Write a protein that binds this ligand. Structure first.
Ligand SMILES: O=C(O)Cc1ccccc1O
Ligand SMILES: O=C(O)Cc1ccccc1O
Lengths: 266, 265
């Protein structure tokens, strides 16, 4: 993959692998989510950030970016053996954080098959206290980002920015006792952001997955699941089919995530 | 990737991805096993299977894994290019063998090798049978006719008999369940997930201080989408060895047994 001519975005092609596809022999939303993460890391690499991102300033003040929110819309899931091209870029939202956006194209047709936007907040690793992006951080970051606004989701008041409410007991559907295994951890032994997308979708009934395709997912990240936590995944039909989602620790019921999904009849 | 010049083996290059690596920023054995599976599928596509032949489709037969044996000398780093070569062979009426050699693209050194035994099963009744002559002939035009072994050694660890772990196990991870990412395109649990479940009962101390060199895994029974699994391990041993058992958490029906070998980093 490569930076574009202007150096303000990054493109990469992926051939969809046999184990990456589900029952329709097309990429799972988890495979898509993994590719977005991979092209994100390859963009950070190419512009001299750490890949574990962190600029030299925020390493000094032991600071890290963590996802507050992920939003993905898929028009077409690529088939097994298809080539998908993904472009990604980053933008400042002042001291309110950072945004990473993706566009997914059919390499052959050049048609837009999906888009995603993610909101990222600055956190002290150790104390894990959120804070506002600090001055010297912004400057060091703006030289890699378009100066004029560039939005995967430009429509003024669009799905990617809706407030998500808290599912109330009792849930229509549940999957309880979900635990991450070593394959679910990243290189720093934290649970991979993508795992949580799998845990949300686990409480969706098999009838829906069999008769519908996932068109939209929005997921808020409230608190991390540690390697030795257990998770319950709750869903309620709010209607296309729509669902409200809650992931919570299996004991005390501490909220780790909430979200919404929209599904189209095949 | 492509078939080699003589059309009797298949090669493919893979760049190791961010999310494919563990704590040492090298590829997990699960990532390796996924790449073996992908290259095996690309070989099958390249010679016109779908891994059923025409005759097998007529009779509703499938190949299933009996055994996977993997030896890793060096796990490729995040961003490394790894080259994998794979071929198959008839073992007469017993079943088929798929073999793999992993190389460092840059140096061309052999960094790993694997071998797997496949038996023929009626898809519907789930009953094993011996490979018929009509199937054998349809497969011999895609396989080298002289033996080609990833594991040629005289007493190689790839062929050893694996005993049944005795209760009590030294270590266990209880209540393991597959999610939808653990299923293949036909809604069966991916062969690779079972590798993941075996390794879950290895203490974190061993994982932090040792590297996996060898794993042998027998496949007895498949885990269904709504089954639950217990993972058992006992030390049998500077090298550490373990005996492994996966069993259904209720009645304790055996699904897998294996051995692992770990060397101090
Ligand atoms: O982790 C990444 O970089 C991309 C990603 C994928 C899925 C959910 C959240 C998220 O931020
Ligand atoms: O499934 C495949 O094609 C190859 C494979 C991978 C991992 C374990 C067993 C096995 O046969």
């Amino acid at each position: 993959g490569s930076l574009t001519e202007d150096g303000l975005s990054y493109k990469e092609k992926f051939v969809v692998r046999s184990y990456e596809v589900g029952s329709n022999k097309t990429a799972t939303v988890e495979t898509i989510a993994n590719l977005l993460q991979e092209v994100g890391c390859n963009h950070a690499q190419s512009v001299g950030f750490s890949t574990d991102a962190t600029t030299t300033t925020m390493r000094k003040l032991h600071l890290i970016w963590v996802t507050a929110r992920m939003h993905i819309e898929i028009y077409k899931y690529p088939a097994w053996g298809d080539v998908v091209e993904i472009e990604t870029w980053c933008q400042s939202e002042g001291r309110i954080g950072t945004r990473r956006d993706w566009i997914l194209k059919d390499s052959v047709t050049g048609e837009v098959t999906g888009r995603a936007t993610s909101k990222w907040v600055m956190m002290n690793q150790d104390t894990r206290r959120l804070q506002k992006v600090s001055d010297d951080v912004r400057d060091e970051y703006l030289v890699f980002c378009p100066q004029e606004p560039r939005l995967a989701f430009p429509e003024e008041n669009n799905r990617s920015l809706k407030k998500i409410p808290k599912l109330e007991d009792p849930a229509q559907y549940s999957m309880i006792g979900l635990k991450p295994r070593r394959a679910d951890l990243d290189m720093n032994q934290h649970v991979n952001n993508v795992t949580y997308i799998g845990w949300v979708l686990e409480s969706i009934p098999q009838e829906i997955v069999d008769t519908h395709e996932l068109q939209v997912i929005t997921l808020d990240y409230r608190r991390e699941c540690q390697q030795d936590d257990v998770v319950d995944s709750l869903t309620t039909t709010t209607s296309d089919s729509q669902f409200l989602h809650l992931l919570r620790l299996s004991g005390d019921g501490q909220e780790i995530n909430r979200g919404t999904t929209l599904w189209r009849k095949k």
